[PDB]
Design a protein around this ligand. Structure first.
Ligand SMILES: CCCCCCCCCCCCCCCC(=O)OC[C@H](COP(=O)(O)O)OC(=O)CCCCCCCCCCCCCCC
Ligand SMILES: CCCCCCCCCCCCCCCC(=O)OC[C@H](COP(=O)(O)O)OC(=O)CCCCCCCCCCCCCCC
Ligand SMILES: CCCCCCCCCCCCCCCC(=O)OC[C@H](COP(=O)(O)O)OC(=O)CCCCCCCCCCCCCCC
Ligand SMILES: CC(C)CCC[C@@H](C)[C@H]1CC[C@H]2[C@@H]3CC=C4C[C@@H](OC(=O)CCC(=O)O)CC[C@]4(C)[C@H]3CC[C@]12C
Ligand SMILES: CC(C)CCC[C@@H](C)[C@H]1CC[C@H]2[C@@H]3CC=C4C[C@@H](OC(=O)CCC(=O)O)CC[C@]4(C)[C@H]3CC[C@]12C
Ligand SMILES: [Ca+2]
Ligand SMILES: [Ca+2]
Ligand SMILES: [Zn+2]
Ligand SMILES: [Zn+2]
Lengths: 670, 669, 499
């Protein structure tokens, strides 16, 4: 028993010896016997289109060898091309492509393949002729044209769309045919990201194309020499304001923002006229921060009285504006803290209390904060407001504050009978008002987290935790399902059975007598700190089987949560933090730039408590700077391909081909 | 001065333009120009033969690094002075070393470097062979820990030079080519060299990574030399060679984890493990556990048959190492079942129960006799080098203590009216501790299994790291216990219970021992918060003591435990890449424990012509080693010119060769 | 220039510093390449601190300068050249080694040649100690440890005697200092072992010979602060710990003499701010700090050394996460205090707070709320502390929900985040553990190299020569630079990547 190997499919036909001689002389550069064989071909002894073992014709063989003279000789004898231009384009040589203008999947073109290989000279000499590429449809287009080609060949339609978007996302085509390469890179990265979101099967290619566009935009920004052209590119309006930087923030260009030139420009705009703060010692820095933060209402009122002069100019600096806003929020938190100390004046027994001075201060403070939030809604969109978590947290905190003050004034108007607090009902409006006040205090002090993004030490850590909270959500779903299952089981088993529940000195068996009680009891089992003792799993009338089964169920739940799920969460956090920490600086710089751009504008200056010829000249300046950046980028990147690309086996084969050419020339001459 | 004026501080004599053009003619490959320049140098001109570049590049040197043999022969034909140009040819691995050898300041090499040392450093088989054929000698290094007059004199004169010379000598000896060419037994040489280099890395705290890399190189060379075996006859010749598997025992002794855990070695060990068992592993798992249980219940009949008839087929079935491993496992399991039965009282003297404990004593005496017998052969160093031997020594000492205490209580002596140090109570406590150790000895049997094996090996490997972190935490605990006892010993009250082991925990920090216990039990949360209160109304003392308790809890739980988790993460990621190698080495040790004929019986029953042969074995081993060395040399030569890659030196060689051909063509026409 | 063009100025400064920090320019055009590399790495580190942008460029330049200094030290092939290099001063001192430690050159210091030189100067007149058997080493170290005071009084009465010169060996001096500190900790332990006195004098058994040791520690810290400045004193965290413990000991001594000459009665009737109680509490805290100073001795050992260094490196990340946890804790503490301060009761209770058997008034004040939320990490706060005596189920539910939210956010979220983040941190810092451990161990070694401060704590209380030194150092620098540029060309033409 031995398998006998046989060639199932015929691929190479030998036929006569002249075809093999032509194939052997094609990959050896033997010019004179090649022209003799071509003269015999003109006589008619052999066929020009010869298929070898590799399936490559003589034109393909001489294109792989990158030889122009013998290729010109082949073209002068009327050889069949058969998409040899694509093969010459893929081998990335100028001469073969320009002499062809004098397998591969059918949806591509010479322009598409030239953009795929990212060859600037091949693209710029294929763009001398008029070339138009088919405009792809939008990511939400479902017209009859899009509903007819997919039925015929969905795979061909998807590959054609991917090839079109890969041709458009090439850097060299962005240089050659677009007025604004920066805006084209931004919009193309956004479109490729939303295509990766939509096209779930091909999301890796679209993601890498979006990354390629973003890297191209970053490395195009990196070619700026002086700060004048940097302010030219970063203030351009498509049709001071920093419109292009705002567009880069909007289009999630994290690499563009975290560029050192852009970061230095952001620092210079952010510190304003106080450029010596960066070179100041640390003690002077804390002293400056403390001095600007202590007399913040003086600066605010002095800007309110006279904005034009120098005392209204220091607040106009976004760094001092941010410090004033931070001190404003800190004294708001101080008022929240002092509410408890002020309120201890026998006002804990009144049904509807009279509002103190702190209450009037706090209602003024949250009216100012609500007005600031309303201004942010009216100025910069709605969905982008919902994107950022501080805005949602502040909206919920302000809603809770509004409900608190509404319930407080309702209780003051209606419930104004003095009594003791022990005799009140559970759902009295005052109690609900103070509960929502406690929740709003929690959220107000938790809103201090997003002032960490401007710190160089606590910034990237907070950004990493905010990035890794999605792992907690995705695992929270699974834990909620497991908790629901064990809650159903324990409630079903234990429903047959003063202070009731687990919030007692002696936690009775009645904690498992209800569904919400069972969820409460199994919720305090996660921490493994004996918050719910094991005698709550004992029946009150000595049912040993049911109590033991409940104890086994609780033990299985404790194993599955504590010893399995918590360690799994630790492992997923390990992988997430190892992936996240590679680019934590870039995300921190992007978030800090967003926080700085939130303070750059002059429309929201005062803190929460106190609250054509020019277009053509700009277009000409931007076009000149863009042409300079294009030239610098092209020379730089061609230096990188000449200096960093490693040699291949094809280079060695080409060197052997040149050596055999010289050997054959010496043989023929001598 | 607003600008930095840059000047050359270390200036030289430079070169004349004629000498610079002559060096350029050396570089490019103008044979006619260097010949004309040398002919002009014979007569009294500016150009001298022994010119020195500012970079220290003599014309012979730049001729050598361009791989132009004709140029080298041209300079040695006119008696150009030769210094360390042979070393430059050796380091470049250039075939002109022959011309440098037959040919009759600033040096880029250390003065202790000789041609054979550098050729062994470069690991070139051809140059090493050439130098050994010409006749070379490496100086013999001394012992690792020696204090002779020469070593201390050289250390007093120059410790750096002595250490560098010793490291260079050991780098030369540890090269695979020198062992393959000049050693009688390459396997023994590699084993002893790796052992010596490991001891040197332990002794020399500096250059430790160098000696560890050299030992790893020796081990890796031994593994590759064993990898060239083509027949099982050659493998049995190599492994059973002595000057029975003597060489395998030697490789286990020298900690050669890569010589072992080789597929051929493991195949031979598995063939000797399931001996006369055709297709054992190619069976369903259920049948395997069924027949394992059948052998397990049938341990005493096989033991009795071995004790009464070693030549019987049933008396030879126990002689199989796997069957005797199952027999020993069944014996230990039956002993543990007897311990469990013993775990399931008004007399001061406790006689042994008439059923349970009375047959337990033969297992105890069998374990003791086996431990003494195993300690007698092999030595005491390997006894303390195995932690399971420490564990069962502790268990046997505890069992002997229980036996002696039971005897003392029988010949000398209600339960609630006994002294706390009654010999019966101490005997029962030590018996329970010995039961813990005996039942914890079962983890050593996980090495035979292929699933729990590597896991058990890795989790036993990180125990040294565990001990280091436990040292750090013990220092922290001692500090905080000292502070809390110093604060709280003024408020000691004297109440049936006094300590943390009752419902109302009291006097937790009144005693230093009790403070240690209270701080130990606070990791698991078993110490409540009322232990920081005193009877008096001293709120400051209570607050400061509770702040100490909080700081200790913060350190020992948030800080120290998470540092421990991080360092077990790093250790496990470091040791999981070799888990198969260590597991197979430990499984080989476990197998070869049962391979020997001695100790066949389980512990309940274990207490009851030559010169011609040596010459033939040596000749067979030398022939096998010659074939192995030839195969290894050919393989590493074929490996050597493939995975090396292309540097800039070979591109410069290509440019120089093409330029030389161009200039020769120009000279022809 | 910055007002006219800041980007051009920054690029020009970066280009100038890139040109100056190149190894070839320093090897060719600098008088002292080692001093140039050290100072250049210092300026590049300071510029990376100042220039927030281009931080990676300046850090890479500083690392390149340090790597060049290490390679230039690598070319020393003689011990005479190494002794010339390390002892050179610009104006057996090891002045250049001290300069490299000051400039934080971890790779230069942890080079094996200077490591061997420092080990030779460490085991002064110790033949074969580095190859001795380990329990013999332990027995001999114990023998020298019990013999610290006889060597100390021998140095007191006869420094020229061989017994008085045995303490001049740095290893013997370190052993005697560690034995002294162990005797101090033994006295601290004996202080607690074996009153109603309002004006209790220090007992003669233990506390009377504690006082001279405290004076010795204070005088040693003062001498260390004088000789070296205050910047290096605040750079070391162990010096800060020693200063804290000495301040606590001085405060304990002052409170004891105050309680002796004033406020001269049973123990249970004392004031809660009684000076004797404050003195005992500060003595206990100082005892904790003194016994926690023993971890600094782990640096000498080769096994616990890198582990202790890695834990010290991860302490900064510990504090960085503790800031975030403290913000969370203040948030939830103010929320629970605002919810629960209305239900504050006395009721004739002997207890008010979380620190007894019946836990009550957990969230009544902000201090008690902070304490109760602090102890919820370790699970020492029971679930009934969120209950009020009134029948207000809504406020109880809100308090239980906020307590559970805080428990989740701390224990499930932030503790596991901290575990993962220190996992990554220990993965990052274990690659370079050996060089930082060797740097710290060498700092510990030349802490004992100087002649001053030899005694332990209880007993502690011209032109032609300089010109020839410059010539010798310049010839060694010529040889080192020639070898380095030769190796640079060798390594440079054997770069395994072909473009
Ligand atoms: C500012 C940034 C802070 C750090 C980032 C915080 C992100 C958000 C944190 C999670 C969301 C808030 C807590 C939600 C839980 C809660 O409020 O829960 C609070 C309540 C407490 O009720 P009782 O106190 O009455 O029992 O829980 C319940 O009502 C029980 C029924 C619902 C159970 C939900 C449990 C969710 C899972 C939480 C633990 C997951 C463990 C996973 C590891 C095994
Ligand atoms: C939901 C997806 C995630 C989970 C997927 C499944 C994985 C987890 C499967 C859990 C299966 C049940 C576990 C056993 C619970 C149980 O038997 O608990 C049941 C009983 C408890 O009885 P009482 O509750 O009456 O005391 O356990 C015993 O009787 C004691 C002896 C058996 C002990 C078994 C322990 C198994 C290992 C669990 C602890 C691991 C700790 C490791 C520390 C390093
Ligand atoms: C040994 C060398 C290595 C370790 C070096 C030290 C590193 C750790 C330093 C910790 C310093 C002590 C911190 C305060 C502890 C204390 O005594 O705190 C004790 C007191 C409680 O007082 P009582 O015990 O009297 O009630 O805490 C408070 O007063 C509340 C307000 C302060 C809370 C500070 C909390 C800081 C963070 C600590 C917990 C972090 C958990 C994070 C979970 C996600
Ligand atoms: C309470 C007492 C009875 C102990 C209860 C547990 C034992 C019955 C178990 C625990 C671990 C088990 C061992 C775990 C691993 C192995 C290896 C495995 O055998 C092999 O893998 C042999 C080698 C091979 O197959 O290549 C099966 C037997 C053995 C010793 C097992 C025997 C049965 C043991 C001792
Ligand atoms: C309650 C009191 C008595 C303290 C109890 C613990 C001490 C006896 C231990 C704890 C840590 C130990 C130290 C840990 C590490 C070292 C380093 C080691 O010495 C060296 O490595 C010296 C340098 C070298 O060999 O290169 C042994 C001594 C010493 C100081 C140890 C001395 C003994 C110490 C102080
Ligand atoms: Ca044993
Ligand atoms: Ca100090
Ligand atoms: Zn469409
Ligand atoms: Zn010797």
């Amino acid at each position: 028993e031995v398998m006998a190997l046989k060639d199932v499919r015929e691929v190479k036909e030998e036929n006569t010896l002249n075809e093999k001689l032509f194939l052997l002389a094609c990959d050896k550069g033997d010019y004179y016997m090649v022209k003799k064989i071509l003269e015999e071909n003109s006589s008619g002894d052999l066929n020009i289109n010869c298929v070898d073992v590799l399936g490559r014709n003589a034109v393909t063989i001489t294109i792989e060898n990158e030889n122009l003279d013998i290729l010109q000789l082949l073209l002068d004898y009327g050889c069949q091309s058969a998409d040899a231009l694509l093969v010459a384009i893929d081998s990335e040589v100028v001469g073969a492509v320009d002499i062809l203008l004098n397998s591969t999947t059918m949806d591509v073109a010479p322009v598409i393949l030239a953009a795929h290989r990212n060859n600037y000279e091949i693209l710029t000499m294929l763009l001398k002729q008029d070339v138009s590429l088919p405009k792809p449809h939008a990511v939400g287009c479902e017209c009859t044209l899009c509903s007819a080609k997919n039925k015929k060949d969905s795979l061909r339609h998807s590959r054609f769309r991917l090839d079109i978007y890969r041709c458009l996302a090439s850097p060299a085509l962005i240089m050659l045919t677009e007025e604004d390469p920066i805006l084209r890179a931004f919009e193309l990265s956004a479109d490729l990201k939303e295509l990766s979101l939509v096209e779930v099967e091909f999301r890796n290619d679209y993601e890498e194309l979006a990354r390629q566009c973003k890297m191209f935009a970053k490395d195009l920004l990196a070619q700026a020499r002086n700060s004048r052209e940097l302010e030219v590119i970063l203030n351009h309006t498509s049709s001071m304001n920093l419109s292009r930087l705002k567009l880069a923030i909007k289009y999630n260009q994290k690499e563009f923002v975290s560029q050192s030139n852009c970061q230095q420009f952001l620092n210079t705009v952010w510190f304003g006229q106080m450029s010596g703060y960066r070179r100041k010692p640390t003690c002077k820095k804390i002293m400056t921060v403390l001095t600007v933060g202590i007399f913040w209402p003086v600066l605010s009122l002095c800007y309110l009285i006279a904005p034009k002069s120098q005392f209204g100019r220091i607040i106009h600096t976004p760094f001092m504006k941010f410090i004033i806003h931070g001190a404003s929020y800190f004294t708001f938190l101080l008022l929240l803290n002092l509410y408890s100390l002020v309120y201890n004046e026998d006002k804990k027994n009144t049904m509807g209390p009279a509002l103190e001075r702190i209450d009037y201060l706090l209602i003024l403070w949250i009216i100012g904060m609500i007005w600031s939030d309303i201004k942010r809604l009216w100025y910069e969109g709605l969905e982008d407001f919902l994107e950022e978590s501080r805005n949602q947290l502040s909206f919920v905190m302000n809603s809770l504050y509004l409900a608190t003050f509404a319930l407080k004034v309702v209780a003051h108007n209606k419930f104004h009978d003095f009594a003791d607090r022990k005799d009140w009902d559970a759902f009295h409006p005052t109690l609900v008002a103070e509960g929502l006040f406690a929740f709003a205090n929690v959220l107000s002090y938790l809103r201090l987290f997003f002032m960490y993004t401007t710190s160089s030490i606590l910034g990237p850590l907070q950004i990493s935790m905010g990035q890794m909270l999605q792992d907690f959500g995705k695992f929270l779903g699974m834990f909620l399902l497991v908790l629901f299952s064990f809650t159903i089981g324990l409630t079903q088993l234990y429903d047959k059975g003063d202070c009731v529940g687990i919030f007692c000195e002696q936690q009775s068996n009645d904690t498992f007598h209800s569904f919400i009680g069972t969820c409460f009891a199994l919720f305090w089992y996660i921490f493994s700190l004996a918050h719910v003792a094991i005698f709550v799993t004992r029946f009150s009338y000595g049912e040993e089987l049911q109590s033991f089964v409940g104890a086994v169920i609780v033990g299985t739940y404790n194993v599955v949560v504590v010893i399995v799920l918590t360690k799994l969460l630790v492992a997923m956090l390990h992988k997430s933090f190892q992936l996240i920490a590679n680019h934590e600086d870039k995300e921190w710089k992007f978030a800090r730039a967003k926080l700085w751009l939130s303070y750059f504008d002059d429309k929201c200056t005062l803190p929460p408590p106190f609250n054509r010829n020019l277009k053509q000249k700009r277009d000409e300046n931007y076009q000149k700077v863009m042409c300079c950046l294009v030239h610098r980028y092209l020379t730089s990147m061609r230096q990188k391909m000449q200096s960093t690309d490693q040699a291949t086996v094809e280079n060695l084969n080409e060197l052997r081909q040149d050596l055999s050419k010289f050997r054959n020339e010496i043989r023929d001459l001598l | 001065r607003d600008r930095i004026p840059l000047r050359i501080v270390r200036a030289e004599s430079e070169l004349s333009p004629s000498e610079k053009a002559y060096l350029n003619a050396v570089e490019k490959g103008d044979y006619a120009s260097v010949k004309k320049s040398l002919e002009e140098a014979e007569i009294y001109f500016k150009i001298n033969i022994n010119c020195i570049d500012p970079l220290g590049r003599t014309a012979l040197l730049i001729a050598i690094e361009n791989e132009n043999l004709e140029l080298i022969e041209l300079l040695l034909s006119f008696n150009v002075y030769v210094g360390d140009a042979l070393l430059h040819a050796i380091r470049k691995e250039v075939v002109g070393a022959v011309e440098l050898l037959l040919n009759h300041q600033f040096s880029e090499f250390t003065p202790d470097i000789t041609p054979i040392i550098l050729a062994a450093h470069t690991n070139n088989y051809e140059i090493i062979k050439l130098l050994v054929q010409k006749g070379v000698s490496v100086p013999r290094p001394h012992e690792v820990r020696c204090n002779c007059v020469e070593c201390v004199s050289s250390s007093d004169v120059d410790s750096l030079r002595h250490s560098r010379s010793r490291l260079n000598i050991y780098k030369a000896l540890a090269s695979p080519s020198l062992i393959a060419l000049s050693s009688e037994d390459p396997f023994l040489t590699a084993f002893q060299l790796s052992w010596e280099l490991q001891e040197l890395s332990k002794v020399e705290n500096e250059f430790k990574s160098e000696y560890e890399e050299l030992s790893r190189q020796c081990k890796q060379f031994a593994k590759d030399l064993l990898d060239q075996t083509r027949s099982s006859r050659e493998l049995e010749i190599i492994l059973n060679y002595r000057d029975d598997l003597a060489r395998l025992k030697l490789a286990i002794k020298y900690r050669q984890k890569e010589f072992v855990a080789q597929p051929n070695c493991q195949q031979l060990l598995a063939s000797r493990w399931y001996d006369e068992f055709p297709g054992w592993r190619r069976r369903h798992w259920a049948v395997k556990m069924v027949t394992c249980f059948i052998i397990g219940l049938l341990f005493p009949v096989f033991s009795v048959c071995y004790l009464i008839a070693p030549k019987s087929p049933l008396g030879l079935f126990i002689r199989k190492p796997f069957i005797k491993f199952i027999c020993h496992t069944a014996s230990y399991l039956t002993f543990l079942f007897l311990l469990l039965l013993a775990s399931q009282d008004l007399n001061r003297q406790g006689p042994p129960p008439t059923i349970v404990e009375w047959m337990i004593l033969p297992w105890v005496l069998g374990f003791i006799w086996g431990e003494i017998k195993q300690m007698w052969d092999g030595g005491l160093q390997d006894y303390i080098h195995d932690w399971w031997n420490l564990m069962d020594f502790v268990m046997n000492s505890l069992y002997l203590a229980t036996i002696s205490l039971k005897i003392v209580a029988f010949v000398k002596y209600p339960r609630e009216s006994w002294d706390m140090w009654h010999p019966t109570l101490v005997a029962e406590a030590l018996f329970a501790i010995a039961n813990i150790f005996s039942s914890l000895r079962l983890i050593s049997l996980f090495t035979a299994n292929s699933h729990l094996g590597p896991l058990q090996i890795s989790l036993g490997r990180m125990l040294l790291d565990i001990l280091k972190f436990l040292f750090i935490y013990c220092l922290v605990l001692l500090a905080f216990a000292n502070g809390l006892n110093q604060l709280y010993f003024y408020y000691e009250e004297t109440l049936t219970c006094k300590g943390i082991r009752c419902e109302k925990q009291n006097n937790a920090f009144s005693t230093l021992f009790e403070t240690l216990q209270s701080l130990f039990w606070s990791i698991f949360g078993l110490i409540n918060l009322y232990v920081t209160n005193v009877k008096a109304q001293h709120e400051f003392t209570e607050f400061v003591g509770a702040t100490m308790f909080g700081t200790y809890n913060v350190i020992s739980l948030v800080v120290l435990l998470n540092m421990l988790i991080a360092m077990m993460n790093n250790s496990y990621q470091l040791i999981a890449d070799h888990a198969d190698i260590e597991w197979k080495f430990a499984r080989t040790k476990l197998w070869m424990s049962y391979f020997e004929e001695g100790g066949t019986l389980p512990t309940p029953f274990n207490v009851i012509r030559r010169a011609a042969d040596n010459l033939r074995r040596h000749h067979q081993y030398q022939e096998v080693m010659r074939n192995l060395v030839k195969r290894y040399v050919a393989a590493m030569i074929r490996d050597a010119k493939t995975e090396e890659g292309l540097t800039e030196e070979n591109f410069k060689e290509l440019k120089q060769d093409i330029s030389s051909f161009r200039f020769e063509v120009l000279g022809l026409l | 220039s910055s007002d006219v063009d800041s980007l051009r100025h920054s690029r020009s400064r970066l280009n100038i510093y890139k040109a100056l920090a190149s190894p070839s320019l320093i090897a060719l055009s600098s008088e002292d390449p080692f001093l140039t590399a050290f100072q250049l790495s210092w300026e590049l580190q300071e510029l990376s601190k100042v220039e927030n942008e281009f931080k990676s460029e300046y850090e890479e330049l500083s690392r390149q300068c340090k790597q060049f200094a290490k390679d230039l030290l690598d070319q020393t092939r003689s011990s005479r050249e190494l002794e010339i290099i390390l002892n050179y001063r610009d104006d057996n001192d090891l002045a250049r080694l001290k300069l490299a430690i000051k400039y934080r050159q971890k790779e230069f210091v942890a080079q094996p040649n200077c490591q061997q030189l420092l080990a030779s100067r460490w085991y002064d007149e110790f033949p074969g100690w580095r190859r001795r058997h380990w329990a013999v080493k332990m027995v001999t170290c114990f023998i020298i440890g019990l013999l610290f005071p006889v060597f100390s009084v021998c140095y007191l009465i006869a420094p020229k005697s061989p017994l008085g010169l045995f303490i001049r060996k740095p290893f013997i001096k370190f052993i005697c200092h560690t034995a002294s500190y162990l005797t101090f900790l033994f006295l601290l332990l004996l202080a607690s072992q074996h009153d109603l006195n309002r004006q209790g004098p220090p007992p003669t058994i233990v506390e009377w010979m504690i006082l001279p040791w405290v004076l010795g520690f204070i005088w040693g810290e003062i001498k260390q602060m004088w000789d070296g400045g205050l910047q290096d004193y605040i750079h070391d965290w162990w010096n800060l710990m020693d200063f804290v413990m000495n301040s606590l000991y001085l405060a304990t001594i002052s409170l004891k003499i105050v309680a002796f000459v004033k406020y001269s009665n049973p123990r249970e009737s004392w004031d809660m701010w009684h000076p004797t109680l404050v003195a005992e509490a500060l003595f206990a805290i100082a005892n904790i700090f003194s016994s926690l100073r023993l971890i600094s001795l782990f640096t000498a050992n080769s096994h616990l050394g890198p582990l202790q260094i890695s834990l010290g490196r991860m302490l900064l990340d510990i504090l960085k996460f503790l800031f975030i946890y403290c913000l969370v804790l203040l948030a939830f503490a103010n929320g629970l205090n605002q919810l629960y301060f209305y239900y504050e009761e006395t009721k004739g209770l002997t207890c008010k707070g979380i620190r007894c058997e019946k836990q009550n008034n957990a969230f009544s004040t902000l201090f008690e709320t902070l304490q109760s939320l602090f102890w919820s990490i370790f699970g020492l706060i029971n679930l009934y502390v969120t209950n009020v005596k009134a029948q207000h189920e809504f406020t109880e539910f809100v308090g239980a929900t906020m307590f559970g939210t805080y428990n989740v956010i701390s224990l499930v979220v932030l503790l596991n985040m901290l575990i993962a983040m220190m996992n990554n941190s220990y993965q990052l810092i274990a690659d370079h553990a050996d060089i930082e451990w060797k740097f710290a161990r060498t700092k510990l070694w030349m802490s004992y190299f100087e002649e001053g401060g030899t005694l332990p704590t209880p007993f502690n209380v011209r032109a032609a020569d300089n010109l020839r030194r410059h010539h010798q150092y310049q010839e060694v620098m010529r040889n080192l630079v020639k070898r380095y540029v030769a190796a640079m060309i060798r390594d440079a033409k054997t770069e395994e990547g072909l473009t």
